[PDB]
Design a protein around this ligand. Structure first.
Ligand code: CL
Ligand code: CL
Ligand code: CL
Ligand code: CL
Ligand code: CL
Ligand code: CL
Ligand code: NA
Ligand code: NA
Ligand code: NA
Ligand code: NA
Lengths: 247, 249, 247, 249
C-alpha cells in the first residue's frame, strides 16, 4: 500500500537524514538506499516508484537518465544545474511523458513561502532590504538563500525607483552588500543557526517576513511533501513553490 | 491636450480619514479634487462638478443612501465605511445590475501592508503544525484583541480546517496565559505606551518558524492603498469586496 | 593543577550534561560522579574541592550538610528551598566560614542578565509586559522564568501607577495572565525551544530585552562560571547574579 | 505656602529641541518657565528673572560662553549640545572650582531607553562569544552607521578587551556583507522608509542569544530624560558627564 521511495547518496549527510525520515513515515516504504558503488538496477529490482537524490553534481545526470528511462519519479536537491543540463532533462522527459522530475534549491517549506511572500510584496513598497543571520562557522556571506531572495526582490521591483538613501558619509561595509540594488546584511553570531528577515517599508508602515530554522534538519517536511505530491505534475518542475499550490 | 486628472470627490471630508484623503488627493498630480462633502451637503454637488469616483468613509447609517445615489449616477465608489451585512452587499449588487459600467469597492482595510499580511497568513496557515497571533497596540485602545487580529485568526482557522488543532501540553496555568481562543487560534493582545498598531502572525513546525509582522507607525499609513483603489477602481466593473484583488496577486 | 569538581545526581539529565562539560573543560578535573546509592565519602576520598548538585529536593539537605562539614564548596541547582532550609544552610556555614554555597534558580547567563536588565529598566517606563514562547510539550503556562521575571518587574515598580490600559471589551484571556499587575503572555508553538521578551514603553519610545535559548544545554556556561568563581564569596549566595560582578 | 516650581530657562528656544523643551516645561506642574532665549537675547535675562537651571541645546560655537556665564551666576545647566573635547570638559571643571554649589550635566543622549540600552550592552558584552550591532533608520539619514550605533559598538569593544575576537569562518563574500568594523564589532545599517530610529544589540554563545532593542517612534522621545535631568541636576554638585549616573543604577 505505502509508496516505495529510494534514496540516492544515502551515506551523505542529507541522504542519511532522508533515509530515517522515510523509514519513520507510515505511508512511505524505503525500497532502496544507494550510494556510490551500487548499481541503479537495485531501484527497479525492488520496485522503487520515486527517489530522493542529493548526490553530487558529477553523478546526478547519470542517475536522472536511468530514472527517467525507467519511469521512476525524482525529487532532486543536488545542485550544479546549468541551462544545458535542464535542457537535457527536458529532452529525456519527452519520451516518458508520465514521469515527473522536481529540481529545487530549497526544500524548507518556511523558506519557500518566505521567498514567495517577498516576491509578492516587493513592488508595493519604496524600500526593501534583507538581513540574514547564521552561526559563525559559515564560509559564505551572504548565504545562497539570501542572495537568491534579494535577486527575486530586485526582479519583482523592475521599473521602480531604486531604494531611497541619503547616505553621504559612511564606514566601508555599513550599508551591506548590494545584490541587484537590494542591500543584504550578513550577521554571524554564535548561538544562531539559520535565520532570515526581509524588510519592506513606505512612509507610515513596514512589513517584515522572518524565517527561522532552529535545526539543520528542518527541510525534511518539504522533501517528504515533494515525494508525496511529485506525480501531480508531469514533466520537469523547477523549485518547490509550484507544488505548494498557492492560490 | 494632456488630460486633466481623474475627478475625485471625498464624502465625510471633515472626519479624520476623509480630511487625510482630501489632502492626499490634492497632493497627487494625476487626481483632481472635485468635491469635499460632509453631512449637510447635497450629493448633487458631486454631479454638478463632474465627479467620477468618490472616497467614502462616512458612517454605517448613511453609506447605503450615498451608494444608491452614486450608482444611480454612474459614479465609482471606494468605500471604507463598515457595517456591511450580507443583505447590504446584496442590495449594492442589485443596484449595479442597472448600471453595469459602474464600479464599487468595499474594503475593511486599505493599508497595503496589512492586506498583504493577511493574504500571507492565509497562504502559510495549512503548512505548519502551530499558528498564533500576537498584536500590540497603544494603551488607549478599547478592544482586545483588535478587529484586524480577530479577522486574521479567523482566516487562519478557516484555512486550517481538517488539520489537527495546535499542539499544546499545557496542564497547569494562570488564567489568561494562553491568550484568547479565536476559532482554535490563540490571540495575545499587548497594550504598551509608545506603540501604535502592530501585528505578528507566528507559524511553526518542529525545526522552523515563519513570522509575518506588520508595523504601522502612523495613523495615516492606509493612504497609499486608498489611492491605489481610486486609480484602479474602474478596471473591475461591478462590486469588489476587499483590496486584495486590486493588488493583482 | 586543575580544580577538582564532583557532580551529584550524575545520572540525571542535568548531572550527565555537567559530567561531560567538566570532562571537556581543560582547567577542571572530574573527581567524582555520584548518584543515589553512592556514599559521599567518595568526594573526600578523591579530594573533591567543589560539587555541582542537581539532585532532588528530598536529598539535597543531606548532601549540603556533608559538603559544608567537609569544606567542599557547592553549586546547587536543585529547587525546593524554603525559608527554613535556607536558614539551616546559613547555620551550618557559621561553623565553616571559608566554605561557599551558591543556590540558583537559573544558570543560563543570558537569562540571568535579562532578569537583571528588566529589574533596572522597570521603574523608568509607563508600561511593562512579558511575552514568553516555548515548545508545545511544556506543561506550565507561564514558565517559571517568566513568572519570576514579572515578579521582579512588579517589585521594582513599587509606588508607580499600574500599567495604563483602556481595554473595555475583550475575549477572555486576550490580555494574558496578571502576575502582580504585569501581563504575561505564553506562546506555545512547534519549532520553538525557550524564548522570552520583556517589553517596556512610554510615549515616544520602547525598550525590548529578548533572550533566546536554541538548545536545552545552554545553561552549561553559567554553571561552569559558578564553579570557577564560587570561592570568591564566602558563605551563602542566592542567585547567579552576584557572581557576574555587575558594576 | 506651597512652593512655586523650579525656575527653568531654555537656551536655543527656537531650535527644534529647545521649542519642544519649552512646551514640556510649560506643561509640567512642578516647573516654571522663567526664560526662553535664542541668539540675540542677552543672558542677563536669566538672572533678571531668577532662573535656577537652564536647558541648553544651542550650538558648539556658543555653548562655552553660555556655560561660563551660567556657572559664574550659580545657574545649573543641563546641556545636550555636542562638541565637548577634553580641553572643554577641563575648562568647565575649573570654572566650577570657584562655584562649588553649582551643577552641570553634559550628556550626548537624553532618551532614557537609549541610555539604558547602552548600559545594558556594556554589562552583557564580556559574557558572550559574539557581539554585533544592527541599526535601522529612515532613509533621509546622512550618516551610516549612526552616532549612537558607533558609540555603542565602541563601548562593547572596550568591555570585551582581552577576550578573543568575534568568531567568523567567512572565507568568501560580496563586499559589505559583514557590515562596518567598529573596533572589531560589526555594525549593520539599514535604511528603510517607514522607520524612525531603531537599534538592536545582539550577543551570542553556542546555545543562546540575548538581544537589546531600542525603538524611538517619535523624534521627541528624549523629553522625559531631559526633565529628569532638570529635576535632579542639583543632587550632584560639580560636573556630571552622561545621564547614566542620574538614573541611580
Ligand atoms: Cl552552513
Ligand atoms: Cl544557504
Ligand atoms: Cl482594529
Ligand atoms: Cl520544559
Ligand atoms: Cl522555566
Ligand atoms: Cl545618531
Ligand atoms: Na516508512
Ligand atoms: Na491633485
Ligand atoms: Na577536564
Ligand atoms: Na509649568
Amino acid at each position: 500500500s505505502g509508496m516505495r521511495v529510494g534514496v540516492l547518496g544515502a551515506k551523505g549527510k542529507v541522504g542519511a537524514t532522508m533515509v530515517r525520515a522515510v523509514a519513520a513515515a507510515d505511508d512511505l516504504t524505503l525500497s532502496a538506499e544507494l550510494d556510490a558503488g551500487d548499481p541503479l538496477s537495485l531501484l527497479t529490482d525492488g520496485n522503487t516508484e520515486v527517489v530522493i537524490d542529493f548526490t553530487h553534481p558529477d553523478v546526478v545526470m547519470g542517475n536522472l537518465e536511468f530514472l527517467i528511462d525507467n519511469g521512476i519519479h525524482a525529487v532532486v536537491g543536488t545542485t550544479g544545474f546549468t541551462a544545458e543540463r535542464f535542457q537535457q532533462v527536458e529532452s529525456w522527459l519527452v519520451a516518458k511523458p508520465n514521469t515527473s522530475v522536481l529540481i529545487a534549491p530549497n526544500f524548507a517549506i518556511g523558506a519557500v513561502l518566505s521567498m514567495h511572500f517577498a516576491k509578492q510584496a516587493a513592488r508595493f513598497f519604496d524600500s526593501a532590504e534583507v538581513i540574514e543571520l547564521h552561526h559563525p562557522h559559515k564560509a559564505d556571506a551572504p548565504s545562497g538563500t539570501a542572495a537568491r531572495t534579494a535577486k527575486l526582490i530586485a526582479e519583482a521591483r523592475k521599473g521602480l525607483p531604486p531604494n531611497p538613501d541619503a547616505t553621504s558619509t559612511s564606514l566601508p561595509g555599513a550599508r551591506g552588500a548590494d545584490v541587484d540594488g537590494i542591500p543584504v546584511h550578513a550577521v554571524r553570531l554564535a548561538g544562531l543557526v539559520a535565520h532570515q528577515e526581509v524588510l519592506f517599508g513606505t512612509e507610515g508602515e513596514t512589513l517584515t517576513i522572518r524565517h527561522d530554522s532552529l535545526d539543520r534538519t528542518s527541510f525534511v517536511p518539504g522533501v517528504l511533501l515533494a515525494v508525496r505530491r511529485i506525480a501531480e505534475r508531469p514533466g520537469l518542475t523547477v523549485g518547490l513553490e509550484p507544488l505548494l499550490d498557492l492560490h
